[PDB]
Amino acid sequence: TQLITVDEKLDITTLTGVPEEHIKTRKARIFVPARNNMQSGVNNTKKWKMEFDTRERWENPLMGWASTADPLSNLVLTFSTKEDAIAFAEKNGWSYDVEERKVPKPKSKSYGANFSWNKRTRVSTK
Amino acid sequence: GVRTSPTGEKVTHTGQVYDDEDYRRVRFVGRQKEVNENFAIDLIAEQPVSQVGSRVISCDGGGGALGHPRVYINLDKETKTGTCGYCGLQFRQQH
Amino acid sequence: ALFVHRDTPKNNPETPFDFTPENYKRIEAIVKNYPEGHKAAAVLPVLDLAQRQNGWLPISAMNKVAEILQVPPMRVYEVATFYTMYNRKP
Amino acid sequence: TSVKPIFSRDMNEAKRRVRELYRAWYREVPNTVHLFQLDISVKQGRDKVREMFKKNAHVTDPRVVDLLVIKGKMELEETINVWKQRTHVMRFFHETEAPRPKDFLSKFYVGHDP
Amino acid sequence: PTVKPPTARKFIWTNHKFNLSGTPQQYVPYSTTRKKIQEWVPPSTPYK
Amino acid sequence: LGLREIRIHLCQRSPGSQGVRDFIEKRYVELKKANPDLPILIRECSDVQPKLWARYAFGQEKNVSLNNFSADQVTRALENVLSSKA
Amino acid sequence: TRPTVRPRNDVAHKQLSAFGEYVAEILPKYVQQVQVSCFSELEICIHPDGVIPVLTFLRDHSNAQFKSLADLTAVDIPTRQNRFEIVYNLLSLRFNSRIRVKTYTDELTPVESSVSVYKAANWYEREIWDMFGVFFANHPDLRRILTDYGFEGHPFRKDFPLSGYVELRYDDEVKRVVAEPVELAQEFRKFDLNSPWEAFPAYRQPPE
Amino acid sequence: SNLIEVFVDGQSVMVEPGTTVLQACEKVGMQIPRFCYHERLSVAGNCRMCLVEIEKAPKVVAACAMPVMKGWNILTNSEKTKKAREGVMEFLLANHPLDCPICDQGGECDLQDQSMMFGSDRSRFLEGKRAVEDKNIGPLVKTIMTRCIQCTRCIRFASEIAGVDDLGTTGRGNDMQVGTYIEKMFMSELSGNIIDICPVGALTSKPYAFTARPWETRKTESIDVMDAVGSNIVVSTRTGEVMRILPRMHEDINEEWISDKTRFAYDGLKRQRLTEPMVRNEKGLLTHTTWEDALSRVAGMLQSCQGNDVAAIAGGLVDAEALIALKDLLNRVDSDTLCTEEVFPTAGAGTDLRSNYLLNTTIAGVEEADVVLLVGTNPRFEAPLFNARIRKSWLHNDLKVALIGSPVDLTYRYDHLGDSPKILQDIASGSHPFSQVLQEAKKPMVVLGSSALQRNDGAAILAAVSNIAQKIRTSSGVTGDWKVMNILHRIASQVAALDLGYKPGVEAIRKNPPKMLFLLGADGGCVTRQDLPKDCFIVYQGHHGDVGAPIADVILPGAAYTEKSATYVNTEGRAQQTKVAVMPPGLAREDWKIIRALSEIAGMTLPYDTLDQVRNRLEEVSPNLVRYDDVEGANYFQQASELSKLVNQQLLADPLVPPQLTIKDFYMTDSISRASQTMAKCVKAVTE
């Protein structure tokens, strides 16, 4: 036979060594990251990301540095699809919320519309 | 151009001084608060405005490659001098 | 040789400029050369008319041309700085 | 849904391996308290062993409990052979860690953590 | 520097100091920035 | 002590909410005229099962499933809610 | 393209492509992909049931003789359902060549240990147990090799954080080094460095 | 279909006729480099960075402007495409100043990035550069015009989206300068988006200036609460401190823009902040105290209340979690008196049906309308991106807009029908000429401002506007899927408070005044201690000490919108959630956490412990508050119209005047904007 049948839900939380506070109180966010509106490039909107809820950052008394007690504060995971990210979050016992991919809708562009005879879409300058 | 708070603590060129009721002054007790007393905002105000006969001037901060990236400053405003964004030296068109 | 305006006491938006009535009849004749809905097409002659009455263009001729043609004043400033005949200095 | 096993074909062989690992830890706790010269009792160390076994008691996947038995055997091998020091044995007893706020109200008082 | 002297600057220390660690003149670190969040100060007058 | 608000959750499109929709299209106006100072919050949503929430005095809420009811069954459940006031 | 561009080696590319065809047709039971990179390195991507038959082939076949195990490696790629990519780097001293054998596993499927092929693997896959959590079946002494003795978790997994979950200090009350949950006086500052402009059009993935 | 076949690098793709070369390459996932093209601006075609080879054509074409012909093979990576890109990048960098270390655009600069990606690695320019005089266009946009690459995104934005026509190009040739030509101050409500679309550091944020740098910023995706539009934003933080607020692209809300209040009011979020619980001492002064003492002193008074003895006013910035928190808490005391500051008329259906207080069409449905009637609103300042969507429909769909109210500037031309409300009775009777315009319209849209409902005849105004909408929809050529009746809200907390069942307006408190009053962020000054009895126990819960905090007995320091994961519902009914960007300062806590802790101190503990359990309660009260980025359609306009015909409320003779006539009244509306030094500089800049 050399193969067994496991119908149970895949759960590896007891094997990952993560303490329980950072399993059951964290909210993973699964999302395609929004485009930086400072830039027109879209190559950072191609993949899915999993981040976690931001915890407390406080002031270091000595230097004023940003101290944290969150181990997952810098953990950003990359996924090719939404379903891979959902399967990875469910596998690790992380409660998650998923935002859908926001694509820009197709625009109707016409350079001749800048110089219409009777429409408001005439440019007053160029 | 250093000054002193009413607690006796020196104010840095940033403007940092601890409050009177701030406990973190205890780190200077028996020790010193290291401040630099050469405030760069006061020293660049001591430099005279360079009168040039051009409309656009270039500044690299002196020393050529030992200065900053060479930038070009327009001098069309006669109300305001033209200040270098790197070194703070300021220029005026003499006409 | 500059393409910004600074308000001087002899060139400001309160400098007195107004067309003569015969120049208003000439402006009406200019505006009637263009289709209805394209009165902005009379920016270049009328502004030049403001240069033929005054000799040059303070920024009240530009504002008056913008006012009587119902175009924004920036769209008259663009024309007055684009074309090399419009004397923006006396 | 047809996966390759590690050691156990089902959950009964898996519970057998869990049970033998618990027997081995139960036998080892007095020797561990003696040779590491721990300040705990044998009853307290056996309660910690029972706590660590009951922490994983919800698992129904045979491969996951096979890996839990494998990791428990590794911890036991590091304990029987003196590879752990006293500090590694006492890390199961979080003694210097202050008790966390449990209810809603004390977690509200101390900070922002849910 | 007797032969080739260093370039004079108004900001270079005229008095060199040695390692001052272990003395009352030693460096003590501190945050050089100001307070980020301004708190609301309640009014000093009563509310009746 | 008495009823404080009524909440009716329903779908816009599901057939199980259909009788509930048939309650609001026909019988809600005279219901609101009969109970002018009672908030009867109709909340439509995308895929919810029909539901009748009755909040009473001191925060007590009863919960009645309105799934696959006719308009007469919604009327009878809602008038049981109005006449109970428990 | 002479001075600044790396020169392409077409002879080694053709030879490694022919040998990849050779391996793929001798062992079609396990070989899934064969690829040769543009800098002429051969990768044989296999099914994990053929760890022992492929590696014993490359070690013992007269046209392969990959006697040296240079390195054994896992790579964590969490978007794959078999997230761990087990990488064997082999050296043939006879034919002066290198080959890469790649396979895959998830957290729960054991990979067969290759200590019976290369004894060099004994620590490497042991490291793969310590760093990634991949269990190797029929390993002689499989245990941790690099982490601390009571260490929980597998650090080179990409969902394991950079600083861990615990940190050590000496506590003078208990006269002992103790483990506590990690607090950093300065948080590691995450830098978002990726440009939003495409760098390499040759590697463009086809869209949805 | 009439799709034509074109080729991008040999790959076939079927495109609509009129598709540009750039869009055809976008359909196969290739982004052509650009500087002047922007997909929400008109096509300029003057940076020439998008020049691409079409094969069997001996001339590169401008891909942003050139429509594809059938059978073109677009060569995005060919040799002369790359040479065209390198030459154009060389000309862009010839006169560009060496300012990257002192420029705020560095790291998020399009010119830097596609100089790295598509330009050469070195310079051949052996001359002196031009240097351009800087302009002064206001306290928001720092202007360093030597960095300008003359892409005219400035001018197209200010002309087409902002509707301003004050930016332009003066001069000619290399001396061509983008500016205003005069000392003129570009202060729109949307003036900060030219910082976004400027590809270079020529237009930067003056408040954000020099402080941070994009690679070290953490990006938290969140929601605006400065109005009821619900603009999606990025709060960019750095080391636990909010650095700036950028837009997120949401095609149906804020397309990629935000208002200047949204963009720049975040520095009010670090002034005047409530950081510790305060109670009144023996002298009657607010002194700092612990959470135990403050919650005990509130809960001891809450246990002595019952019925109308305790009430609550919700402010403008309150999330739905704290709203249902305080609602459940006061319902444990058997109090239904939970009010909002913004008055919605409860006559007829009231807040029972969702449709009579929503923007039922949508923000996006403005693009489907052909006639818009604005009643009693100034949507330029009440909901600036709703006004931007109206201007986009005006510009591209030839939308007819009419206004009943004071003749405010809306940045487009409308038909001002007059400011008297009796015109609403003339349109509903057909005697008015715009009534026939509404009858012959196919997709009409009637938008009643919620600021017009603040009048004493707000029920009569709502009844007249609903009468117009139901005269149209039941009789004229409206399909039935189309929603005519719309209400534009201006308060971010309002729609979630109406969905949860609050009583809008504070008339329930003026009717019978309580001996205990909660103020969740209530800074509108709607109820002061002259309206309360002799010693009313006022509890202010909020994040700023502005209006309600100096008169309070106990202050409960709460979280702001950047400081909590929090549900807000916009004017169209779309529920959205913020995310935690930073934590609240000091001893301040999340708002429903405070109310739940108070309920546990008072012995009336609410059945939730985590945020998910609050959202389960929130789903129990109305299940659309937890379906995020979903507009749930609300039916039953006929039943609300039949209920509105019961009481004949009379229209007042006072004209419809919105409270915000000019840009002066825009910048300070809530407690965060009033605490903002940037908004104060904006007010001082527009009043001079």
Ligand code: SF4
């Ligand atoms: S705009 Fe871009 S290229 Fe120009 S100085 Fe700024 S960062 Fe550098």
Ligand code: SF4
């Ligand atoms: S300032 Fe910026 S947006 Fe305006 S034309 Fe120049 S480069 Fe373009």
Ligand code: FES
């Ligand atoms: S992008 Fe087409 S020319 Fe500027």
Ligand SMILES: [K+]
């Ligand atoms: K910019």
Ligand SMILES: [Zn+2]
């Ligand atoms: Zn300089």
